[PDB]
Ligand binder design. Structure first.
Ligand SMILES: O=C(c1cc(Cc2n[nH]c(=O)c3ccccc23)ccc1F)N1CCN(C(=O)C2CC2)CC1
Length: 350
């Protein structure tokens, strides 16, 4: 039969459920899509991968950068097959190298969800796009370009583009209202400091993110791979999140998520600290302080959340003991402090 979805929702579904596009992104992360096919991805395989990354972290923390690290890394590479051709497999020793493999394990986890969704099939009663959309359990409502909502989020996106991210501009192609099943029932409405904040992710992750929500990293993952602990990270500057779309000149279409974030009492921090969650003791979120952020003067309100609009003003924060974050980032440690609201289809103009 024919599809009953809006044509804009149809395009969105085709975009995020493109398994072959997921194949391409993984091959660009030096992952072996043939020896270990994304159709044969198991939660247990990804689980063992996280555990291998933890053993690597143990070696780095212990200074054991010889045999032990070599064998630890080889265990990760055996559980998570890589395709380096004739290159020798590289040792994982810095935090950034650790984070890179966490991102890969995250994308594999969200591809596992997406492949399971697309593979669940009916026959000739519903259009395939309609069944994928139903299986999402997340309503996606196309908003009108001339509508008022398009106007406010466009200014949010353009006016919070950071000036140090000058290699690209962004054009808003389409706007969707998001209502994931159950998120509104779980949301901590009692908490104050509710803001509409950004979250960017690779194109492979959206099916998993929309269907399961933004989630807390598993216990077996190495804690040092998360600069402010195992939580859910947002920015008030659109481009800082948009960097995490990992769009390229050739794949210059990505998605940006806007979410209501029940920040409550922020535990404000200057530098990173993977153990930041233990330092909350009563407070509800971590705020990493940046030298630049939208000013309280331009803040507005949308559906009960503070939209930190306006051009970014100089904040005045400076870390004397070390690196100073260029822009804010907020971290909550429970998904019930997050309600997804808007999905932006964004063209990156490099
Ligand atoms: O939000 C994060 C996260 C993101 C990042 C990078 C990031 N990604 N995207 C952003 O918009 C952003 C904004 C400010 C600062 C960081 C970011 C780093 C550590 C993190 F724990 N998550 C970690 C991965 N997520 C998962 O659901 C996996 C399944 C456990 C989603 C929640």
């Amino acid at each position: 039969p024919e599809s009953q979805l809006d044509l804009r929702v149809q395009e969105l579904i085709k975009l995020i459920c493109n398994v072959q596009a997921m194949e391409e992104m993984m091959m660009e992360m030096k992952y072996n899509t043939k020896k270990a096919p994304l159709g044969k991805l198991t939660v247990a395989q990804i689980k063992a991968g996280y555990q291998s990354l933890k053993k690597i972290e143990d070696c780095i923390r212990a200074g054991q950068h010889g045999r032990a690290l070599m064998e630890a890394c080889n265990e990760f590479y055996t559980r998570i097959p890589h395709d380096f051709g004739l290159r020798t497999p590289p040792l994982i020793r810095t935090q950034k190298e650790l984070s890179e493999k966490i991102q890969l394990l995250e994308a594999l986890g969200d591809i596992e969800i997406a492949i399971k969704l697309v593979k669940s099939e009916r026959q000739g009663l519903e259009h395939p796009l309609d069944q994928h959309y139903r299986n999402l359990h997340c309503a996606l409502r196309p908003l009108d370009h001339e509508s008022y909502e398009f106007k406010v989020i466009s200014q949010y996106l353009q006016s919070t583009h950071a000036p140090t991210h000058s290699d690209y501009t962004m054009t808003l192609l389409d706007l969707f209202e998001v209502e994931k099943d159950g998120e509104k029932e779980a949301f901590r409405e009692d908490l104050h400091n509710r803001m509409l904040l950004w979250h960017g992710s690779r194109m492979s992750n959206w099916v998993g993110i929309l269907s399961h929500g933004l989630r807390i990293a598993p216990p077996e993952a190495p804690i040092t791979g998360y600069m402010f602990g195992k939580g859910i990270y947002f920015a008030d500057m659109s481009s800082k999140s948009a960097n995490y779309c990992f769009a390229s000149r050739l794949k210059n279409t990505g998605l940006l998520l806007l979410s209501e974030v029940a920040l409550g009492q922020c535990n404000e921090l200057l530098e990173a600290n993977p153990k930041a969650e233990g330092l909350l003791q009563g407070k509800h979120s971590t705020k990493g302080l940046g030298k630049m952020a939208p000013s309280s003067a331009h803040f507005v309100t949308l559906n009960g959340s503070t939209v930190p609009l306006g051009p970014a003003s100089d904040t005045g924060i400076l870390n004397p003991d070390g690196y100073t974050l260029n822009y804010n980032e907020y971290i909550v440690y429970n998904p019930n402090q997050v309600r997804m609201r808007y999905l932006l289809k964004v063209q990156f103009n490099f």
